mmCIF file of C-alpha atoms in Angstrom:
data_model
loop_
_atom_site.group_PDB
_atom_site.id
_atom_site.type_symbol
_atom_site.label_atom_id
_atom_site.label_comp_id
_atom_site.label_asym_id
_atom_site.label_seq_id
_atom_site.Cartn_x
_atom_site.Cartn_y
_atom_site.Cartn_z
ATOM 1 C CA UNK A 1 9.180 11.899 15.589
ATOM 2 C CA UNK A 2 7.973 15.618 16.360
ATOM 3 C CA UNK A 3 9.154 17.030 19.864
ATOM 4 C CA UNK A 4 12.940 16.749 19.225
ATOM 5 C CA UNK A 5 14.378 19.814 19.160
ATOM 6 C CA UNK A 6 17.114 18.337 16.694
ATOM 7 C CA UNK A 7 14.058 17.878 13.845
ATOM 8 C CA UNK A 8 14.056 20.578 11.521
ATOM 9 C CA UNK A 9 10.663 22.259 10.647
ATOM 10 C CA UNK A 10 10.454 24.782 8.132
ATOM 11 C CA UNK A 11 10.247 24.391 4.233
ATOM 12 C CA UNK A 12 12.022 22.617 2.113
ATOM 13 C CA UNK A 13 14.911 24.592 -0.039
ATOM 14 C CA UNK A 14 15.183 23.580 -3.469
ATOM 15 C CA UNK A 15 18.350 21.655 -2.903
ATOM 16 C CA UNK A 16 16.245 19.456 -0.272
ATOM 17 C CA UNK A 17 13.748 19.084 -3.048
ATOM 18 C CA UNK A 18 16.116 18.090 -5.578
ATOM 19 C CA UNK A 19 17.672 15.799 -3.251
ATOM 20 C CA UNK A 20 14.252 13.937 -1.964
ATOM 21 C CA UNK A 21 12.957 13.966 -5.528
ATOM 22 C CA UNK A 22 16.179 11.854 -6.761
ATOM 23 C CA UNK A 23 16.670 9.521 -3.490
ATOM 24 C CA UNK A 24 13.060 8.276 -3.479
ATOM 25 C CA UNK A 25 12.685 7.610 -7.581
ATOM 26 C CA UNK A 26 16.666 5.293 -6.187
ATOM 27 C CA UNK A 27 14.983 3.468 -3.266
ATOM 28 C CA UNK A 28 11.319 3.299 -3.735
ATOM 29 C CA UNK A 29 9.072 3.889 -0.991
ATOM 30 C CA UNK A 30 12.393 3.102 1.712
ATOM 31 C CA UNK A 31 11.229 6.502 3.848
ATOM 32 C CA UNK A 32 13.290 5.395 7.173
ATOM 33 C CA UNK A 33 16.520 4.834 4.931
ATOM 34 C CA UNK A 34 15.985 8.280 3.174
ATOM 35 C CA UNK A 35 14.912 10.498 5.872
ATOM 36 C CA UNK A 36 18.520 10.617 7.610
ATOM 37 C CA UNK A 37 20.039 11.357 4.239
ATOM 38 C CA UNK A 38 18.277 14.337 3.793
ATOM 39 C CA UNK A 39 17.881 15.312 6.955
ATOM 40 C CA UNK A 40 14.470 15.658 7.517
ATOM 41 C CA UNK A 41 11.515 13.410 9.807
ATOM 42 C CA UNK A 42 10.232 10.076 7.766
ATOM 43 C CA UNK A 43 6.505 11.714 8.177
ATOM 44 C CA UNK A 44 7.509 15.107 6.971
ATOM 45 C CA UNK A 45 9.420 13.678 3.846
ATOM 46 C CA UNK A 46 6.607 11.976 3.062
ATOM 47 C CA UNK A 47 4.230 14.739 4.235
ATOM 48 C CA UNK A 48 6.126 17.191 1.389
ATOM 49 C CA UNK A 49 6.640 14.281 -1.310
ATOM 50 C CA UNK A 50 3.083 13.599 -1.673
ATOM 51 C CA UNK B 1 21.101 -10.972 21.470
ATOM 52 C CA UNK B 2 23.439 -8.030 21.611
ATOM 53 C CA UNK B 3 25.865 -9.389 19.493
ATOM 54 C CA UNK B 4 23.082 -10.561 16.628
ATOM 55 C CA UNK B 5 21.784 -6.687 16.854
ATOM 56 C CA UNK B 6 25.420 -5.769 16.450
ATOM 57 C CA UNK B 7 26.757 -7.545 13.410
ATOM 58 C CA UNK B 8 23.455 -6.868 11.664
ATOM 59 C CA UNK B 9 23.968 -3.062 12.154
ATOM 60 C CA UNK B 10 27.243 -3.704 10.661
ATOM 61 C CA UNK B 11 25.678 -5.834 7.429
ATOM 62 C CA UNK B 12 22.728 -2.992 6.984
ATOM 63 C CA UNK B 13 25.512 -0.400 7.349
ATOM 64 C CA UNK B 14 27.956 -2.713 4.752
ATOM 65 C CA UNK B 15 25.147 -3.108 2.740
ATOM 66 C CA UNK B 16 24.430 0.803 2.302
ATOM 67 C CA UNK B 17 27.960 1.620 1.437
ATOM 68 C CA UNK B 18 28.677 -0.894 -0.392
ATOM 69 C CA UNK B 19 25.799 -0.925 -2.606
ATOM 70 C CA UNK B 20 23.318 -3.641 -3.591
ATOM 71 C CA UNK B 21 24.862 -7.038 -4.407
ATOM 72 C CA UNK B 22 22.442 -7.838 -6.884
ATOM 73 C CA UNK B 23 24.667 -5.808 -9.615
ATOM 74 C CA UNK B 24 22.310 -4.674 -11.994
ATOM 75 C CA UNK B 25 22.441 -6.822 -15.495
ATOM 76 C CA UNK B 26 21.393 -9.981 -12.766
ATOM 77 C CA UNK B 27 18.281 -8.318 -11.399
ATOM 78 C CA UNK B 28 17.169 -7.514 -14.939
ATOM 79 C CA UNK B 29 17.574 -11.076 -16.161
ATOM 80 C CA UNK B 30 15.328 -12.179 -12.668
ATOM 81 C CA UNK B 31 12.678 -9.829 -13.619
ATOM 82 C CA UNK B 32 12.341 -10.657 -17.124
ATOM 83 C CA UNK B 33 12.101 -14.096 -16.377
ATOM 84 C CA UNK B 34 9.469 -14.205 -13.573
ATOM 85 C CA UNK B 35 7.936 -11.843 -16.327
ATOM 86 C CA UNK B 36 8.147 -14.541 -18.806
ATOM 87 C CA UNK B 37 6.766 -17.040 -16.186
ATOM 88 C CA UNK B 38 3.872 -15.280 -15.678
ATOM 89 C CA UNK B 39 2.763 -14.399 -18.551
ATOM 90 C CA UNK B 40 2.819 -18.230 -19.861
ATOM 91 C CA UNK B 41 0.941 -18.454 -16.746
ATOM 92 C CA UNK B 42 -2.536 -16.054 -17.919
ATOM 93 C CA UNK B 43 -2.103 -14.824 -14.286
ATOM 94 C CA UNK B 44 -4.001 -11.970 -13.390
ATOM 95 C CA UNK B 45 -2.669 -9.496 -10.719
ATOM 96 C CA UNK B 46 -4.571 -9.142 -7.692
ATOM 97 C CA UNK B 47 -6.186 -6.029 -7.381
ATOM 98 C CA UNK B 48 -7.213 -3.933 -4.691
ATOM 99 C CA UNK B 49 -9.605 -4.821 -2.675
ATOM 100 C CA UNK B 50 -13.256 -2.754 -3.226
ATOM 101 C CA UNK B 51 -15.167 -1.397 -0.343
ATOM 102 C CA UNK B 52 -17.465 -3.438 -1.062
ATOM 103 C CA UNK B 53 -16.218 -6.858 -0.913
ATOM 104 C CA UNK B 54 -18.923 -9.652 -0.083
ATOM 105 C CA UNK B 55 -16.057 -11.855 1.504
ATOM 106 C CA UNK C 1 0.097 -32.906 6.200
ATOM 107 C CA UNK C 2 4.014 -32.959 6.052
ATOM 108 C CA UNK C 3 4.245 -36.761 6.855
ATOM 109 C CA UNK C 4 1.793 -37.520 4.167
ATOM 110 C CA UNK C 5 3.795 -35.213 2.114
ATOM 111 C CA UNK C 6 6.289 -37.569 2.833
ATOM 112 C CA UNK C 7 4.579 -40.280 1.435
ATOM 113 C CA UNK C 8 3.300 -38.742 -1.553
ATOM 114 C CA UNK C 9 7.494 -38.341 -1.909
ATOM 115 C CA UNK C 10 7.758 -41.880 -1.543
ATOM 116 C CA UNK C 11 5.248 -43.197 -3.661
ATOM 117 C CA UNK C 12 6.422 -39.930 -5.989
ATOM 118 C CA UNK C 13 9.323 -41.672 -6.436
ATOM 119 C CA UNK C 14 8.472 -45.272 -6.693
ATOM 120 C CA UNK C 15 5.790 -44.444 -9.100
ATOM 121 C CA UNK C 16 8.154 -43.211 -11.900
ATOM 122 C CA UNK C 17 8.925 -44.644 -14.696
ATOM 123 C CA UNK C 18 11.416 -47.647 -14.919
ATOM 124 C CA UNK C 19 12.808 -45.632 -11.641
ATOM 125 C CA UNK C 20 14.968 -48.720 -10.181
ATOM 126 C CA UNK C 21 16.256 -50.313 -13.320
ATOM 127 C CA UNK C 22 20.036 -50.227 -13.377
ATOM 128 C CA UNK C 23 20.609 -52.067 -16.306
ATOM 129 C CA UNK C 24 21.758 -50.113 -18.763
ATOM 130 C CA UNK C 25 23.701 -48.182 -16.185
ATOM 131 C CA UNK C 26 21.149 -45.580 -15.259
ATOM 132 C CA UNK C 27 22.198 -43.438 -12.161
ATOM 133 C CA UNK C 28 19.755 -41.446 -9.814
ATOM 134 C CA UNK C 29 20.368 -38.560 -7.394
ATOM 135 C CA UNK C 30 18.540 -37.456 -4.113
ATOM 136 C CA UNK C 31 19.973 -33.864 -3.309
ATOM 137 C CA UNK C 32 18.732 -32.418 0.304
ATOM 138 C CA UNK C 33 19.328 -28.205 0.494
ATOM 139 C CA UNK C 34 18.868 -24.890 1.817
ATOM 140 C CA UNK C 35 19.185 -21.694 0.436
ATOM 141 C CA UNK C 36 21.406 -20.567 3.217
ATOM 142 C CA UNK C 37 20.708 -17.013 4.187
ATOM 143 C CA UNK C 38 17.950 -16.338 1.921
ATOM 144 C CA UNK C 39 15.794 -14.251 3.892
ATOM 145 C CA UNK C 40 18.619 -11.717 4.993
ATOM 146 C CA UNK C 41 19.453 -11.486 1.119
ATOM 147 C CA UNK C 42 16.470 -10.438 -0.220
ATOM 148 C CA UNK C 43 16.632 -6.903 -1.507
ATOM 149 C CA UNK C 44 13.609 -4.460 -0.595
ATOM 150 C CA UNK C 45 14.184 -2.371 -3.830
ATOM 151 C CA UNK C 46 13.779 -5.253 -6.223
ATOM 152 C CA UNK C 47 11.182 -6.621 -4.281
ATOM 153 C CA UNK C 48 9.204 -4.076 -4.776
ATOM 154 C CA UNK C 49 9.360 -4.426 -8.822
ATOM 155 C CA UNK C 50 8.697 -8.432 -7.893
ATOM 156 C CA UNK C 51 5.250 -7.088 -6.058
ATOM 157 C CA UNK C 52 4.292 -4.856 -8.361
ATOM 158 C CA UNK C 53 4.286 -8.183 -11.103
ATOM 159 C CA UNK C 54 1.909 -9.675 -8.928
ATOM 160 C CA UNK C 55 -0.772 -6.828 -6.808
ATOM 161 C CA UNK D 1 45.278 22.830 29.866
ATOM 162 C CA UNK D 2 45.532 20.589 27.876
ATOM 163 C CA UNK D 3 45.008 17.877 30.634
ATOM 164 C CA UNK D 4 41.685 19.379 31.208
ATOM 165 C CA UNK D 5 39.034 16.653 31.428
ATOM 166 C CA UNK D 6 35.919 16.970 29.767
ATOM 167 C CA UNK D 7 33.269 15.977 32.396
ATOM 168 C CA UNK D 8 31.923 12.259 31.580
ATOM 169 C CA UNK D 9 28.247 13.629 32.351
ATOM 170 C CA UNK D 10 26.722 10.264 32.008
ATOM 171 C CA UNK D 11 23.856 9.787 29.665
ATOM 172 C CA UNK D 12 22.993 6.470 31.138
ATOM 173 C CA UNK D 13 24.094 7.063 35.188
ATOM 174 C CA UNK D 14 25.810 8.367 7.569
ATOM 175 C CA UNK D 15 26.682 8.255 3.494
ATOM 176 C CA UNK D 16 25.444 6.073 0.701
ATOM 177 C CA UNK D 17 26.850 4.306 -2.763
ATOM 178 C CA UNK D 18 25.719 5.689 -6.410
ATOM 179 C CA UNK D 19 25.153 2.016 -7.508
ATOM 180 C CA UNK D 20 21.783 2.216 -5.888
ATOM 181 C CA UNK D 21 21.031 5.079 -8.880
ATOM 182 C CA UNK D 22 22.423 2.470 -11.691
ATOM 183 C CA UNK D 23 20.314 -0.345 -10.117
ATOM 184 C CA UNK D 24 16.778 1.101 -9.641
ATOM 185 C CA UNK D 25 17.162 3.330 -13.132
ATOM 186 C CA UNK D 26 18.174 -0.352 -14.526
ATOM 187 C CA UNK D 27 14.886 -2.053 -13.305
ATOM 188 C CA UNK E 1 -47.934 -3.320 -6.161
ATOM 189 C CA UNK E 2 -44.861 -1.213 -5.853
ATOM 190 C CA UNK E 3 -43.844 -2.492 -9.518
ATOM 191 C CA UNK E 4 -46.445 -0.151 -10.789
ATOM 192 C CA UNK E 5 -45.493 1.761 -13.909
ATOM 193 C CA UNK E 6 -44.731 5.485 -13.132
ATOM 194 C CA UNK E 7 -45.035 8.866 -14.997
ATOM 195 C CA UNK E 8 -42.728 11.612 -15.613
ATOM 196 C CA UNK E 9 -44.404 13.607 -12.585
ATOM 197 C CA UNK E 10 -44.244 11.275 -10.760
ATOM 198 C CA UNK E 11 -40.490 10.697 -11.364
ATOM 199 C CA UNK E 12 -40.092 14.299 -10.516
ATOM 200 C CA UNK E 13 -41.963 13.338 -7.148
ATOM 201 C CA UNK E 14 -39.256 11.137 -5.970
ATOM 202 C CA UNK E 15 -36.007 12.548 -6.632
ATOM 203 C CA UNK E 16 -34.895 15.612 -4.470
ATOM 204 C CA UNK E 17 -33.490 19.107 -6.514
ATOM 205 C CA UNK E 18 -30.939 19.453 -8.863
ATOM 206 C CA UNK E 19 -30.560 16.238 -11.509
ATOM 207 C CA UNK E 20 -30.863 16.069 -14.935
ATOM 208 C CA UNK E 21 -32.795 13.530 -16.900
ATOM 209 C CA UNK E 22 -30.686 12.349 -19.926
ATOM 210 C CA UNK E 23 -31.201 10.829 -23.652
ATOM 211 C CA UNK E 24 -27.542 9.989 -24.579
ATOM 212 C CA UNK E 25 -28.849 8.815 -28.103
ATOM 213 C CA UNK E 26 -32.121 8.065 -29.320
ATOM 214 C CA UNK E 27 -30.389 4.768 -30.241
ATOM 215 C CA UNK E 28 -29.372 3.622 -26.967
ATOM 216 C CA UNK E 29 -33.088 4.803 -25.857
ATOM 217 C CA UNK E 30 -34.218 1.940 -28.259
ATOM 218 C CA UNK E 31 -31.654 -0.181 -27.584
ATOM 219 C CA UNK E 32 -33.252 0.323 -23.793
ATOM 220 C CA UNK E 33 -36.572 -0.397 -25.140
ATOM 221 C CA UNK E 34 -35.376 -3.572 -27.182
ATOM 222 C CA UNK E 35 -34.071 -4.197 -24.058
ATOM 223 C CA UNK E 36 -36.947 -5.821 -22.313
ATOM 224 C CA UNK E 37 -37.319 -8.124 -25.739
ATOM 225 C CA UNK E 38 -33.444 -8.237 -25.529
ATOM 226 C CA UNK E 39 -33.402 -8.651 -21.907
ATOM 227 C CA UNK E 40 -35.047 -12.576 -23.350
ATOM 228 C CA UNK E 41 -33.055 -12.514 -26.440
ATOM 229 C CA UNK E 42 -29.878 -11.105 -25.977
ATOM 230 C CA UNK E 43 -29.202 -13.031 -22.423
ATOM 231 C CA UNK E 44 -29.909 -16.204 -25.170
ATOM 232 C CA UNK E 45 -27.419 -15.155 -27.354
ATOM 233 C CA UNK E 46 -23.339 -15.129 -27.490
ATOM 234 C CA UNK E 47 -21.768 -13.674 -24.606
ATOM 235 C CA UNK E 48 -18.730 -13.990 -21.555
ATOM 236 C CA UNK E 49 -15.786 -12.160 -20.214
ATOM 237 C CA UNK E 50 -12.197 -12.528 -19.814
ATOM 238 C CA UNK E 51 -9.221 -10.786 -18.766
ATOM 239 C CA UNK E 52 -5.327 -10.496 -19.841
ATOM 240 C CA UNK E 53 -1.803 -9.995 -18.020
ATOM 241 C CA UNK E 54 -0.430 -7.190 -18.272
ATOM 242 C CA UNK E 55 1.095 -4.450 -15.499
ATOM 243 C CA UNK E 56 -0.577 -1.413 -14.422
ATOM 244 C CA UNK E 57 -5.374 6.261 -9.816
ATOM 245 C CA UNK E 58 -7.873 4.768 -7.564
ATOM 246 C CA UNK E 59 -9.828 7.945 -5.897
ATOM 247 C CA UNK E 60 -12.169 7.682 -2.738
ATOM 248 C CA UNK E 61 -13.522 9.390 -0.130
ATOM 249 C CA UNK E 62 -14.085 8.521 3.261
ATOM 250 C CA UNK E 63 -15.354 11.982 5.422
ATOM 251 C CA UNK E 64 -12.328 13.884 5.642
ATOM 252 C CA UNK E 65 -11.715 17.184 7.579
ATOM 253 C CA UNK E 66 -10.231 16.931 10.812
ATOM 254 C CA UNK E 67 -11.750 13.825 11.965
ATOM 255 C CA UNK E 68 -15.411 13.387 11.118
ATOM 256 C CA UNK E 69 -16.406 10.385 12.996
ATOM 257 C CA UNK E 70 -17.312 7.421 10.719
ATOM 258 C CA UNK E 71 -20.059 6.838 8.147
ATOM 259 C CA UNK E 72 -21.266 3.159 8.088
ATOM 260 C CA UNK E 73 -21.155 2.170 4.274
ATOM 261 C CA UNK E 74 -25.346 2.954 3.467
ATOM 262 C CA UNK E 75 -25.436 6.103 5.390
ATOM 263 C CA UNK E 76 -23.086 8.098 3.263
ATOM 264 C CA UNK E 77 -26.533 7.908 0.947
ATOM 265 C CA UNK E 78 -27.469 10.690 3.790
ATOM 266 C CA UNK E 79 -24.418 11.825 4.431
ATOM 267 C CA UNK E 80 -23.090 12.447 0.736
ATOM 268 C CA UNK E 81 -23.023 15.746 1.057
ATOM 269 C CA UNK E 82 -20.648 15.968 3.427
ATOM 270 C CA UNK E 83 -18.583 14.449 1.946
ATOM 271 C CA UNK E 84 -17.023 17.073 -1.013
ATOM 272 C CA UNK E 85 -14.276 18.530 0.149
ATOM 273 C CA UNK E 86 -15.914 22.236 -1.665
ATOM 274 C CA UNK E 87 -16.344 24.792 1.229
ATOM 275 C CA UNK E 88 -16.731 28.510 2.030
ATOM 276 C CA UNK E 89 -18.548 29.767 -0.835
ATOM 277 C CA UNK E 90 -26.164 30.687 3.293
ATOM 278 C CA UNK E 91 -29.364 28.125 3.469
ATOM 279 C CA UNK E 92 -26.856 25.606 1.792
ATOM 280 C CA UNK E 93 -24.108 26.446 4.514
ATOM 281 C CA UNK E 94 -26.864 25.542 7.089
ATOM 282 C CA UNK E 95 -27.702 22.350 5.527
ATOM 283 C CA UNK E 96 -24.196 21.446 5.572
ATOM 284 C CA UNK E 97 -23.061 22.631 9.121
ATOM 285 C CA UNK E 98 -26.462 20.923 10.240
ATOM 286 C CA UNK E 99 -24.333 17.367 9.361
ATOM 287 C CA UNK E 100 -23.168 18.063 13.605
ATOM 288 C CA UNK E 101 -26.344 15.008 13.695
ATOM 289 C CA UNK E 102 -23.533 12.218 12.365
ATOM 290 C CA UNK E 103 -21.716 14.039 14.782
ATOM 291 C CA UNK E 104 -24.738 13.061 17.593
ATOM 292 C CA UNK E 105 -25.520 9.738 15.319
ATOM 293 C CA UNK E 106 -21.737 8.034 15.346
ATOM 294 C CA UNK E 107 -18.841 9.071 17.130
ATOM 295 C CA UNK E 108 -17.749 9.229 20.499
ATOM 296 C CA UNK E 109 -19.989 9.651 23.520
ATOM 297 C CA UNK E 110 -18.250 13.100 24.151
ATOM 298 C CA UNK E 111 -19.390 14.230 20.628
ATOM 299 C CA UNK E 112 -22.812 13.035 20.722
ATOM 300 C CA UNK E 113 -22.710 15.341 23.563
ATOM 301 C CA UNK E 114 -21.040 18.566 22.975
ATOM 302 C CA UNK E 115 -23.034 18.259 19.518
ATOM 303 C CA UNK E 116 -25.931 17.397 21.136
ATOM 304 C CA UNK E 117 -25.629 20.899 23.353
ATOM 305 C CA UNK E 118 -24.635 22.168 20.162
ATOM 306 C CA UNK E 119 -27.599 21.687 18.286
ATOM 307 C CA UNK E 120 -29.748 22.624 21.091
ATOM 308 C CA UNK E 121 -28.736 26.600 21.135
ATOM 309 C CA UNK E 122 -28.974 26.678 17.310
#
């Protein structure tokens, strides 16, 4: 979830944004099957969605 | 067990590229019928649950 | 309970109306199903529009 | 060179379809 | 008894500072004082409730900061103002960082203590 060096933490770009906005208003509240797509950590997604 | 785990990782991953089955036109006649149903029906949705809830 | 179920079937069917009478050449069908993988079909997204009908 | 063999250091011893979009903007 | 009839002083007894006493008409005042009359005459009289189908935002608070150990559901009466989320701008502030007592109240046994301590020095 957090330790793994392989997560990325730092903000979102606008492309990332762009890309979470569209994905989650396709597959609503799916945050397990979006997170790989963009890249990100399931919590954080959510985290910056909200 | 291993198996089981193993063709379903195939169907979810089948299932992602391939797109949902459903089509589209098909899902909109299912939810415009249960729609229909239910509103014959006077059902009221369920709401939330209060914080203050006797039961 | 499911036995009594059963005979609420039984007498279900016994009680209906002119149920056994052949004469005129009147046919009746018992048809015993599943609905196969039903379950594993379901699709999350339109499930969600199904909940949000109902909660 | 070429028949170099990567060491087998033991460590025991992803796309999607557009029809989603057309779906959920359907419903 | 207690059911006593009360005057406007003494409504200002009760109540602790800053509320406002409101008239929203004169007419609903009367409608308020046919309301003991109507209270008889109006529960005799045409009335019931219903509701429709038709599809569908919900705001709360529990005590929020970092953790805040938890407020049964009457105490938050005490508690309140604790609750808003408003903070860093002097007797007020010390009113509000005095709420470390639901900290001794309800929480863990390691709060009550630390707090406890706390609260001691202060």
């Amino acid at each position: 979830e957090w330790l793994d060096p392989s997560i990325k933490k730092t903000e979102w770009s606008r492309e990332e944004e762009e890309k979470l906005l569209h994905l989650a208003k396709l597959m609503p509240t799916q945050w397990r099957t979006i997170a790989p797509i963009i890249g990100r950590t399931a919590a954080q997604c959510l985290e910056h969605y909200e | 067990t291993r198996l089981y785990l193993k063709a379903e990782q195939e169907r979810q991953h089948n299932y992602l590229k391939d797109g949902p089955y459903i089509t589209a036109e098909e899902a909109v006649a299912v939810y415009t019928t249960t729609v229909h149903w239910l509103e014959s029906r006077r059902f009221s949705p369920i709401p939330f649950p209060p914080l203050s809830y006797k039961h | 309970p499911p036995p009594l179920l059963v005979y609420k079937w039984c007498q279900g069917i016994n009680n209906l109306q002119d149920v056994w009478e052949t004469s005129e050449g009147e046919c009746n069908v018992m048809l015993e199903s599943r609905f196969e993988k039903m379950y594993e079909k379901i699709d999350l997204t339109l499930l969600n529009r199904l909940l949000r009908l109902i909660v | 060179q070429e028949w170099k063999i990567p060491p087998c250091i033991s460590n025991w011893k992803v796309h999607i379809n557009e029809n989603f979009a057309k779906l959920a903007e359907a419903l | 008894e207690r059911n006593r009839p009360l005057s406007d002083e003494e409504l200002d007894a009760m109540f602790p500072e800053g509320y406002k006493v409101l008239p929203p008409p004169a007419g609903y005042v009367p409608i308020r004082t046919p309301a003991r009359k109507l209270t008889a005459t109006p529960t005799p009289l045409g009335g019931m409730t219903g509701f429709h189908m038709q599809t569908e935002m919900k705001s709360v608070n529990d005590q929020p900061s970092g953790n805040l150990p938890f407020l049964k559901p009457d105490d938050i009466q005490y508690f309140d103002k604790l609750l808003v989320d408003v903070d860093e701008s002097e007797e007020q502030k010390e009113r509000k960082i005095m709420k470390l007592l639901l900290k001794i109240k309800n929480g863990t046994p390691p709060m009550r203590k630390a707090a406890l301590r706390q609260i001691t020095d202060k």
